[PDB]
């Protein structure tokens, strides 16, 4: 009942939170609804389908905000499913989550439209679209790889950009007088830009034999340069996914995890909050201010277990490779030196 009531609250909490495969599909369907509403608004923009528009979009939008507040209340009431939020105050601080905060704000504004407006409407639909990723891990992942590749990325853009300018300048001289297309330097700016970007509107382009001559050269340069950053970031992702799978291959931290938790429960038992617990109390008294001795001994040991666990939490593929590599070699060294010492101790006999 009440106990099972709470357990359902917590389970459903992480249901609304990261689901494994099932509720992930559920939120997917949520996205389906919202995205469709977007597209319908898209057709709403045209007057030739207006009368066939308002009913679906209007009622569906209503439904959307309904399920919005639904999941919202589930979130908020399931905020005590963690440790911090509880009763009314802690979960209130949970509401202090700026994600939750602005979510509720936009929520009520969506309510406000219940009674230029359509333009804001479109913008609203955008914003709700941003709502898609809660944790926004996408952005973190991208910025990760980007800042990882900051230097070469910038050198790519900068260099080819210079190629843009020089190209446009020479072409400007070559065809400014001959062709109306290219009359101001800003003209060739626009043209060369879309040129090296492989877009090719075609509204303007050289017709001077001299222009086309120099162009093709600069084409073979610029197009490659601008396509650089695409392929760079692409292969970067592919690698980093491989290596992430590799560390998924190698964790090894079970040992520090065990000792961590062991010293932890040692503290919890030594923790005077529960002296009726005696298994670890009896253990400490039988493994020999005796109370603070057992407690403080566990505190110091469990603290070193904390650091040893955390440090052990990130053993990496070539990291572990070289550490045990040097280790095994140096180990063999100590082993063989012990072998020499042992035999030579026998030599004096």
């Amino acid at each position: 009942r009440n106990a099972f009531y709470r357990k359902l609250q917590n389970f459903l909490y992480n249901v609304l939170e990261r689901p494994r495969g099932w509720a992930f599909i559920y939120h997917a369907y949520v996205f389906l609804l919202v995205f469709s509403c977007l597209v319908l608004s898209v057709f709403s923009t045209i007057k030739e389908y207006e009368k066939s528009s308002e009913g679906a979009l209007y009622i569906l939008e209503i439904v959307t905000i309904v399920v919005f507040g639904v999941e919202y209340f589930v979130r908020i009431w399931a905020a005590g499913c963690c440790c911090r939020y509880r009763g009314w105050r802690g979960r209130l601080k949970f509401a202090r989550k700026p994600f939750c905060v602005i979510d509720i704000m936009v929520l009520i504004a969506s309510i406000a439209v219940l009674a230029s407006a359509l333009r804001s409407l479109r913008f609203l639909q955008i914003l709700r679209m941003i709502r898609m990723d809660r944790r926004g891990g996408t952005w973190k992942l991208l910025g990760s790889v980007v800042y990882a590749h900051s230097k070469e990325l910038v050198t790519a853009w900068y260099i080819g950009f210079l190629c843009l300018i020089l190209a446009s300048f020479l072409v400007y001289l070559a065809e400014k007088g001959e062709n109306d297309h290219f009359d101001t330097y800003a003209d060739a700016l626009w043209w060369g830009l879309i040129t090296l970007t492989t877009i090719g509107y075609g509204d303007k382009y050289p017709q001077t034999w001299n222009g086309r001559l120099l162009a093709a050269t600069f084409t073979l340069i610029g197009v490659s340069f601008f396509a650089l950053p695409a392929g760079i970031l692409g292969s970067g992702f592919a690698l980093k996914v491989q290596e992430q799978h590799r560390q998924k291959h190698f964790e090894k931290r079970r040992n520090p995890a065990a000792g961590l938790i062991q010293s932890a429960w040692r503290f919890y038992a030594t923790n005077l909050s529960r002296t009726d617990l005696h298994s670890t109390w009896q253990y400490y008294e039988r493994t020999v201010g005796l109370k603070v001795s057992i407690r403080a001994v566990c505190v110091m040991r469990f603290l070193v277990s904390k650091r040893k666990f955390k440090e052990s939490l990130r053993p990496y593929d070539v990291m572990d490779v070289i550490e045990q590599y040097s280790a095994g070699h140096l180990d063999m060294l100590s082993r063989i030196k012990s072998l020499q010492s042992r035999v030579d101790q026998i030599v004096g006999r």
Partner: protein
């Protein structure tokens, strides 16, 4: 409190073998050996680094009291503790058989006994099914 500080001072002198206001690694070695355990110089030094904040190499009473006055909720060990349990939660659900939790906890590294791990199951496996709801337990403790 004054009671806690004076009692920690008495235990500190117990640990403070040389009585220099700090606990040296050799004090730690001999004290642990007295309790039966053989702590290496690296282990006792790590203990100092855990406790020692000024970085002197010997655990003065201030660092000891700072360590002692902290609680599991005063550890920020929630993400850490649930990380550990998830490593030992192969399926990721939030439960692992208390048998296996005994099998690794009481049988990994600085392992514990069956009675301590049994009380761990009692306090951890909240519904007492063997499958410890480890995040509920880590929340109830680490908070």
């Amino acid at each position: 409190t004054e009671e806690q500080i004076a009692e920690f001072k008495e235990a500190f002198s117990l640990f403070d073998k040389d009585g220099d206001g700090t606990i040296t690694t050799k004090e730690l070695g001999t004290v642990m050996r007295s309790l039966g355990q053989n702590p290496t110089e690296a282990e006792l030094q790590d203990m100092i680094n855990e406790v020692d904040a000024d970085g002197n190499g010997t655990i003065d009473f201030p660092e000891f009291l700072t360590m002692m006055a902290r609680k599991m909720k005063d550890t920020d060990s929630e993400e850490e503790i649930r990380e550990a349990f998830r490593v030992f939660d192969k399926d990721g659900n939030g439960y692992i058989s208390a048998a296996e939790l005994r099998h690794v906890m009481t049988n990994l590294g600085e392992k514990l006994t069956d009675e301590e791990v049994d009380e761990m199951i009692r306090e951890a496996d909240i519904d007492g099914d063997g499958q410890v709801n480890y995040e509920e337990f880590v929340q109830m403790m680490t908070a």
